[PDB]
Amino acid sequence: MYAVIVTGGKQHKVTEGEFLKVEKLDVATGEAIDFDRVLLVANGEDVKIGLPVVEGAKVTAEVVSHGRHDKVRIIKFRRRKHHMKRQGHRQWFTEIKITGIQA
């Protein structure tokens, strides 16, 4: 039992009881969410290929935490032109746990 879902402009292959980090969602911690845009559900030997979205399929999850990724450092340097610039970045994410896959 696994599914392919779309969230945050990316696609994720998903199995039940899995932890994965996705782009930040506007959901409070501990709240349940569902994913209606399911592209593929495969149940052992049975594979439902989704004409664009598999009809009736839905993948539920609960929000575990919010956080930020490790800092990356940006530098812009133009040699012998007297120019330099620095910047920092930490990207937000939401961690969700997949509770149930409805085929």
Partner 1 sequence: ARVKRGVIARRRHKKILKLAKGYYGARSRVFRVAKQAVIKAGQYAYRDRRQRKRQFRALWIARINAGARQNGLSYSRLIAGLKKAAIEIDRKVLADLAVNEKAAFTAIVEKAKASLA
Partner 2 sequence: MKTYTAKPETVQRDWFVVDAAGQTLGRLATEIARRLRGKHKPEYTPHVDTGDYIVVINAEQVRVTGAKTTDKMYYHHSGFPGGIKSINFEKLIAKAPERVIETAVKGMLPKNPLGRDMYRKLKVYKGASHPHTAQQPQELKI
Q: Does 88 bind partner 1 (CB under 8 A)?
A: no
* 18 near partner 1, judged by CB under 8 A: no
Q: Would you say 68 or 89 has its CB closer to partner 1? A: 89
Size of the site for partner 1 (CB under 8 A): 20
CB atoms under 10 Å from CB of 52, counted, come to 7
| Residues in 4-63 at the binding interface with RNA, rule: CB under 7 A | 8-10, 18-20, 23-24
For residue 80, state whether it binds partner 1 (rule: CB under 8 A). Answer: no
User: For the purposes of burial, counting CB atoms within 10 Å of the CB of 27, is it exposed (0-12), middle (13-18) or buried (19 or more)?
Assistant: middle
- Contact positions vs partner 2 (CB under 8 A): 12-13, 20
Could you identify the residue written with the tokens 């970045």? 89
Q: Is 40 in the site for partner 1 (CB under 8 A)?
A: yes
**33 near partner 1, judged by CB under 8 A:** no
SS (H, E, C) 11-74: EEEEECCCEEEECCCCCCCCCEEEECCEEEEEECCEEEECCCCCCCCEEEEEEEEEEECCCEEE
Q: Which two tokens stand for residue 40?
A: 């593929």
Using CB under 7 A as the criterion, what x/- string covers residues 63-82 for binding RNA? -------------x-xxxxx
